């Protein structure tokens, strides 16, 4: 079924999707994981890295990314989208648009994706709050920053602790702290 479709893999031609579309279709030839990299040139660790955000891109065709979140997102967020594998269809594009409007060092959303995973588990959302990474982070300090007692380990969440400009509730609840 495949003639000369590995030469583009061999020559390293294509941005990033011409790698992943190719490897996923090619994986149903008969060769195992230790055969496609035993020639073309693809480490197993990375062979799986782009062997999922393939399917995360299949997952994020819920909303259309409005031509400002797909320009340089054609072959980027490799480990960024690789690590998110426990998100809710309703947040996979919502966490990615945060990662492309925040511009931090490539692996930083592994920690928000755990507290977000915990946020979409409690039988019922908290009232005057919504399900989002911006709110989860803001509500993450409630069971952390608030739990804290000292100004040394309680004033470090004045920027990363909140920054949920997507929920007034958290902003209205983060007012009695200027004490």
């Amino acid at each position: 079924e495949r003639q000369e479709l590995l030469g583009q893999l061999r020559r390293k031609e294509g941005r990033w999707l011409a790698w992943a579309r190719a490897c996923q279709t090619l994986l149903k030839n008969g060769l195992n994981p230790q055969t496609l990299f035993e020639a073309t040139g693809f480490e197993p660790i990375q062979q799986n890295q782009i062997t999922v955000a393939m399917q995360v891109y299949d997952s994020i065709l819920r909303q259309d990314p409005p031509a400002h979140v797909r320009e340089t997102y054609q072959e980027w967020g490799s480990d960024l989208l690789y690590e998110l594998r426990e998100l809710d269809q309703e947040q996979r594009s919502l966490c990615a648009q945060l990662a492309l409007e925040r511009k931090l060092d490539a692996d930083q959303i592994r920690e928000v994706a755990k507290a977000t995973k915990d946020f979409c588990r409690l039988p019922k959302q908290p009232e005057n709050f919504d399900r989002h990474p911006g709110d989860a982070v803001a509500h993450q300090c409630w069971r952390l920053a608030q739990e804290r007692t000292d100004l040394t380990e309680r004033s470090r969440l004045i920027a990363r602790g909140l920054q949920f400009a997507q929920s007034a509730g958290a902003r209205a609840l983060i007012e009695a702290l200027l004490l």
């Binding site: 490799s78 480990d79 060092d105 490539a106």
Partner: peptide, 10 residues
């Protein structure tokens, strides 16, 4: 490197 356009060494 070729992994500089896939992963940031930081």
């Amino acid at each position: 490197v070729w992994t500089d356009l896939l992963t940031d060494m930081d």
